[PDB]
Amino acid sequence: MQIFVKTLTGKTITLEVEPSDTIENVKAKIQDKEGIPPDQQRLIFAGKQLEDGRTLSDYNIQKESTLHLVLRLRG
Amino acid sequence: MQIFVKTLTGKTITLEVEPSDTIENVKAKIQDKEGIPPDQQRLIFAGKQLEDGRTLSDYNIQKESTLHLVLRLR
């Protein structure tokens, strides 16, 4: 399925994910597509900071939902 | 010299740079520190987006200046 990923600047990309992906898998797919380390990715949906071990579908993330990405600057 | 680099939420790093460092060099220094690819970085100084082949001193970025970093999602 396709979701959107959006930063605080409004920049938006599309990302192919599976509903059964863990958040870690989602961050890995962002890293593959964009080169951003997973530990640098804070992903937010509907108020909540998304946790790596949880699954997208369990957060009721939907087809064409948008995750918000914030840069962590962890290094 | 030291400069600061900040995200839109206020996350801050320092970098060791020279006035003659190109913007490409500085992005590569950020990649070294943070793992972020240079072509994924946009750096801004006091409203002005910094261009890869120019140097810090071109923008009158002196010691202890702050730059802001955003992702390009390129």
Author numbering:
A (entry chain B): 1 to 75
B (entry chain A): 1 to 74
Task: Quote from the publication.
Ubiquitylation is a reversible post-translational modification (PTM) that regulates many cellular processes, including protein degradation, endocytosis, DNA repair and immune response. PolyUb chains of eight different linkage types can be formed since the seven lysine residues (Lys6, Lys11, Lys27, Lys29, Lys33, Lys48 and Lys63) and N-terminal Met1 residue in Ub can themselves accept another molecule of Ub. The topologically distinct polyUb linkages are recognized by Ub-binding domain (UBD)-containing proteins to couple ubiquitylation to diverse cellular responses. The enzymatic system we established allowed us to assemble large quantities of Lys33-linked polyUb, thus enabling structural analysis of this atypical chain.
